Amino acid sequence: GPVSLSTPAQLVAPSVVVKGTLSVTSSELYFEVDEEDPNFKKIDPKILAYTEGLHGKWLFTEIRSIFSRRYLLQNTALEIFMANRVAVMFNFPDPATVKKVVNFLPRVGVGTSFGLPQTRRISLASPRQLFKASNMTQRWQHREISNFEYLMFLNTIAGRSYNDLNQYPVFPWVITNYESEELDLTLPTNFRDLSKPIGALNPKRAAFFAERYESWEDDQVPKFHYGTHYSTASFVLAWLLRIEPFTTYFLNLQGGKFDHADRTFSSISRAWRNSQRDTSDIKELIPEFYYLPEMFVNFNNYNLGVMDDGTVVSDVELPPWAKTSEEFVHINRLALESEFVSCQLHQWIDLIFGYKQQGPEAVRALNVFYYLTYEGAVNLNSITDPVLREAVEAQIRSFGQTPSQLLIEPHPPR
Numbered sequence: 153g154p155v156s157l158s159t160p161a162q163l164v165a166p167s168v169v170v171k172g173t174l175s176v177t178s179s180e181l182y183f184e185v186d187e188e189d190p191n192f193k194k195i196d197p198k199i200l201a202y203t204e205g206l207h208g209k210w211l212f213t214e215i216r217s218i219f220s221r222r223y224l225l226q227n228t229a230l231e232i233f234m235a236n237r238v239a240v241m242f243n244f245p246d247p248a249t250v251k252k253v254v255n256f257l258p259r260v261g262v263g264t265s266f267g268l269p270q271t272r273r274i275s276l277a278s279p280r281q282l283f284k285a286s287n288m289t290q291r292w293q294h295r296e297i298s299n300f301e302y303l304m305f306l307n308t309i310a311g312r313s314y315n316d317l318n319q320y321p322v323f324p325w326v327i328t329n330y331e332s333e334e335l336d337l338t339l340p341t342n343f344r345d346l347s348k349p350i351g352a353l354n355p356k357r358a359a360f361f362a363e364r365y366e367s368w369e370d371d372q373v374p375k376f377h378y379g380t381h382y383s384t385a386s387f388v389l390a391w392l393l394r395i396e397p398f399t400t401y402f403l404n405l406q407g408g409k410f411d412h413a414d415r416t417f418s419s420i421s422r423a424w425r426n427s428q429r430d431t432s433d434i435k436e437l438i439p440e441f442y443y444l445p446e447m448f449v450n451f452n453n454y455n456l457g458v459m460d461d462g463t464v465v466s467d468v469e470l471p472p473w474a475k476t477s478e479e480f481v482h483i484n485r486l487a488l489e490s491e492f493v494s495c496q497l498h499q500w501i502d503l504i505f506g507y508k509q510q511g512p513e514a515v516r517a518l519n520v521f522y523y524l525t526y527e528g529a530v531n532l533n534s535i536t537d538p539v540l541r542e543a544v545e546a547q548i549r550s551f552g553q554t555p556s557q558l559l560i561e562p563h564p565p566r
Contacts, residue, residue: 153177153178153179154177154178155175155176155177156176156177156178156256157175157176157252157253157256158173158174158175158176159173159174159244159245159249159252159253160172160173160174160244160245161173161174161183161242161243161244161245161249162223162242162243162244163183163185163203163205163206163208163240163241163242164223164229164241164242164243164315164316165203165204165205165240165241165315166314166315166316166317166397166398166401167199167200167202167203167397167401168195168199168200168203169243170185170186170189170191170192170195170203170206171185171186171189171191171192172184172185172186172206173186174242174244174253176253176256176257179211179212180209180210180211180212181209181210181212181256181257182207182208182209182210183205183206183207183208183240183242184206184207185206185207196404198400198404199397199400199401199404202396202397202400202401204238204240205240208240210232210234210240212257212258213258214234214235214236215232215233215234215235215257215258215260216233216234216235216260216263216264217232217233217260217261217262217263217275218230218231218232218233218254218257218258218260218261218262218275219231219232219233219262219275219308219311220250220254220275220276220277220278220311221241221243221311221313222311222319222527222553222556223241223243223316223319224243224318224532224545224548224549224553225527225528225529225530225532225548225553226243226531226532226533227247227250227527228243228244228245228246228247228249228250229241229242229243229244229250230242230244230250230253230254231313231315232257233263239313239314239315240315241313241315241316245533246533250276251276254272254275254276255272257272259271259272260275261273261274261275262274262275262277262282266282266286266287266288266305266309267286267287267288267291268282268285268286269285278556279309279310279311279556279557279558280556280557280558280559280560282309283306283309283558283559284559286305286309288302288305289302289564292305292566293564293566295566298489299488299489299493299494299497299566300439300442300443300485300488300489302497303321303323303439303497304321304439306501306504306505306558307321307322307439307555308321309556309558310505310555310556310558311555311556312555317385317388317389318384318385318548318549318552318553319383319553319555320383320384320385320387320388320438321438321439322382322383322436322437322438322504322555323436323437323438323439323441323442323488324344324346324436324437324497324500324504325344325350325424325427325436325437326343326344326346326437326484326487326488326493327342327343327344327483327484327487328342328343328344328353328424329341329342329471330420330421330424330471331421331471331472332471332472332473333472333473334472334473335471335473335474335483337483337486337487337490337492340492343487343492343493345496346493346496346497346499346500347496347499347500347502347503347517348503348517348518349382349434349503349517349518349519350382350427350428350434350435350436351377351378351434351518351519352517352518352519353428354428354429357428357429357431358518360431361377361378361431361518362377362518364376364377365377365515365520373523374520374523375515375520376520376521376522376523377518377519377520377521378434378520378521378522379432379522379551380432380433380434380435380552381521381522381525381551381552381553381554382434382435382436382552383435383436383552383553383555384550384552385549386550387435387438388438389401389402389405390402390411390416390417391417391438391440391447392438392440392447393410393416393417394446394447394448394449394450394451394452394454394468395444395446395447396452399452399454410454410455410456410457412457413456413457413458413459413460413463413465414459414460416456416457416465417468418456418459418463418465418468418469419468419469420448420468420469420470420471420480421469421471422469423435441481441484442481442484442485442488443481443485444481445476445477445478445480445481446477447468447477448467448468448470448477448480448481449467449468449477450465450466450467450468494566495565495566496565497566498562498563498564498565498566499563501558501563502562502563503517503519504555505555505556505557505558505559505563506557506558506559506560506561506562506563507559507560507561507562507563509554509557510526510557521552521554522551522552524547524548524551525551525552525553525554526554527554527556527557530544530548532544532545
């Protein structure tokens with residue numbers, strides 16, 4: 153029918169990011185991939201298969217929330233949540249286009265769940281304002297909301313999305329013990345100190361980081377502790393390699409064949425041990441660890457290979473205290489919702505979204521990441537040469553993106 157607005161745009165999904173045309177009528181919006189685009193023709197069919205929205209139609213009456221979003225650090229995207237819980241994300245040429253598209257879409261704001269006004273303005277408000285205006289924190293303190301739900305909240309308001317693997321939601325490691333036959337949930341010794349970044353948990357390696365920072369002479373590039381981030385599209389793929397379509401997404405970007413068995417996710421204990429010792433691995437966890445046991449099972453009877461010591465890779469090797477993947481997720485969740493976590497979870501939040509994310513307080517906590525990682529680090533529309541824009545964004549896609557800062561003051565305890 154008659155289109156009130158039309159703009160070039162990119163569909164952002166876990167599978168791909170394709171250029172196309174986003175149209176907005178008076179009753180719905182729809183997207184059409186540009187099949188004449190070169191980069192499109194290159195894309196592989198097994199992947200485009202799992203993609204939703206290439207020829208999508210979304211009815212206004214079904215729209216529940218509309219969130220302002222970044223994409224590769226640019227404040228030029230938008231994620232829309234439907235009544236059937238489906239979410240679709242688009243990226244636009246500039247922030248001006250976002251405002252316009254928002255003014256043509258139903259006035260629902262950010263939804264009803266976060267105790268925020270349902271105005272088009274709320275849908276464009278900054279993460280900091282959403283935080284400040286919400287009642288989720290209080291609800292979290294009154295235990296009306298779980299730790300899990302509150303974390304998803306912080307992640308959502310910060311711009312983290314399941315649609316963009318480059319800004320995946322970030323959840324903390326909580327259990328440190330993957331050896332014992334039993335996991336005593338009352339042993340403070342079995343819990344991760346949430347006040348410290350992964351890079352600081354290991355005193356031996358922490359010294360290494362402290363010294364890199366100290367001696368880094370920055371003519372142009374600010375000092376930093378990690379040239380690696382805690383959240384990446386790669387990590388996500390590795391974590392969920394056992395689950396389709398992620399298996400296909402992984403196989404595709406890798407070259408058709410799995411990774412070197414000695415590097416694919418195969419043990420929880422091994423993954424944790426590595427995040428503790430390897431100077432290039434200070435990785436945090438993923439929400440699925442606390443609710444999707446399927447990622448730990450090689451249900452698809454895929455190859456996956458054999459490590460150099462002869463260990464065959466199949467289901468993920470669980471700790472002795474977890475006989476099944478379901479038991480593993482169940483205990484992970486108990487841990488997350490335990491009082492041990494509730495009494496200190498705000499200190500982790502200060503590192504990830506809080507006042508310890510940047511500046512003096514960040515250096516004190518050993519929480520400084522590569523500067524290209526923070527919002528505002530680079531203006532992509534500033535790069536007129538396309539080949540070059542593509543390169544810098546490949547570096548962003550690769551270095552990771554620190555979540556939008558939600559507050560600059562200490563986060564209140566639960």
